Amino acid sequence: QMVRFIRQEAEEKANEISVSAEEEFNIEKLQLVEAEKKKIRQEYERK
């Protein structure tokens, strides 16, 4: 009966991994969307 439960456990692990990846995705996106007001002070403000 736990043969099908193995699939459920694998699905739960994959869902947890995907949830962690998505949670870090917002931070990764904000790492570039934000703080560029500082990097533009060197990329173009130097000009």
């Binding site: 009966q1 736990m2 043969v3 439960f5 193995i6």
Partner: protein, 311 residues
């Protein structure tokens, strides 16, 4: 084997009917004594001090001969496959015991130098020591082979405390429990019988633990793959075969070295003939004694004959 059994009598102290009768036509024929000898003097002999030094070194020479004899009789025979070298195969100085003891031809240039034997005796002793060292090397090789023998095959034949992978069934583990229903697919039966297998499954540890060690008698773990056990058994068989071959082929070389040691002992007896001649007669080597392995009655008769030079 047999220790030294040579008689002591110079040329001037022959115990036979005549001085030259020691070799043949002696009264020993009537008593069936196997005594026989043949002269083989060296080129020259040392002085009185040299004779005394040789007599002193004769004790060490006899000790070395005894050590070689003990090694040859023990290492070869104990292997139960090296004692195949008979008297002819182990002939001393190229002649069997019938002829080796009847002559001193071993005094040729092989072990000694066919020269004043004061240092030639030491040289022959060193050669015999080298031969004994080779025999000891062969014995050590035989011991290492026996260490290779009694290998992993000495363990149990599977489904037991040791080497149980040979009887493995190859979520499950090698249990072989010698004298279950749950969510897990416990409806199974492994091939772990050399023993018995029980219903178990890795999906839920309840059935697996119950079958393995939970109740009754705990099972014995073993390697999962029987290929490793088969390889270990094959290696053990190969090591046993190699040990047997060494006891039959390398120990055949050991038996050849034992025959060489017998030749060295014949040379030592030839030297001891001249040593006794110097001790109880003049310096030049000349002896009329004999070397054999007679019975008690024959030795007593020889002593009665030679009582003119008793100790």
């Amino acid at each position: 084997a047999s220790r030294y059994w040579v008689v002591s009598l110079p040329v001037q102290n022959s115990a036979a009917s005549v001085w030259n009768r020691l070799q043949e036509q002696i009264s020993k024929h009537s008593f069936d004594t196997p005594l026989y000898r043949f002269n083989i003097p060296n080129l020259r002999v040392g002085t009185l001090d040299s004779l005394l030094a040789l007599s002193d070194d004769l004790v060490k020479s006899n000790s070395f001969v005894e050590s070689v004899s003990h090694k040859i009789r023990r290492q070869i025979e104990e292997l139960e496959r090296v004692s195949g070298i008979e008297s002819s195969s182990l002939s001393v100085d190229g002649v069997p015991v019938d002829t080796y003891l009847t002559r001193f031809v071993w005094d040729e240039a092989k072990y000694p130098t066919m020269s004043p034997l004061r240092e030639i005796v030491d040289g022959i002793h060193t050669l015999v020591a080298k031969i004994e060292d080779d025999l000891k090397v062969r014995v050590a090789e035989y011991n290492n082979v026996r260490s290779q023998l009694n290998a992993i095959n000495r363990k149990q034949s599977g489904s037991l405390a040791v080497r149980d992978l040979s009887n493995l069934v190859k979520l499950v583990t090698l249990l072989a429990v010698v004298p279950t229903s749950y969510v897990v697919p416990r409806s199974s039966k492994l091939l772990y019988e050399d023993l018995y297998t029980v219903t178990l499954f890795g999906r839920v540890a309840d059935n697996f633990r119950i079958a393995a060690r939970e109740k009754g008698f705990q099972i014995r773990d073993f390697e999962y793959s029987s290929e490793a056990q088969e390889s270990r058994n094959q290696e053990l068989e190969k090591l046993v075969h190699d040990q047997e071959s060494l006891r039959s082929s390398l120990l055949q070389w050991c038996y050849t070295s034992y025959g060489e040691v017998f030749s060295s002992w014949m040379h030592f007896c030839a030297v001891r003939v001249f040593a006794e001649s110097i001790l109880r007669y003049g310096l030049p080597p000349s002896f009329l004694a004999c070397v054999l392995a007679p019975s008690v009655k024959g030795e007593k008769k020889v002593r009665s004959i030679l009582e003119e030079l008793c100790g």
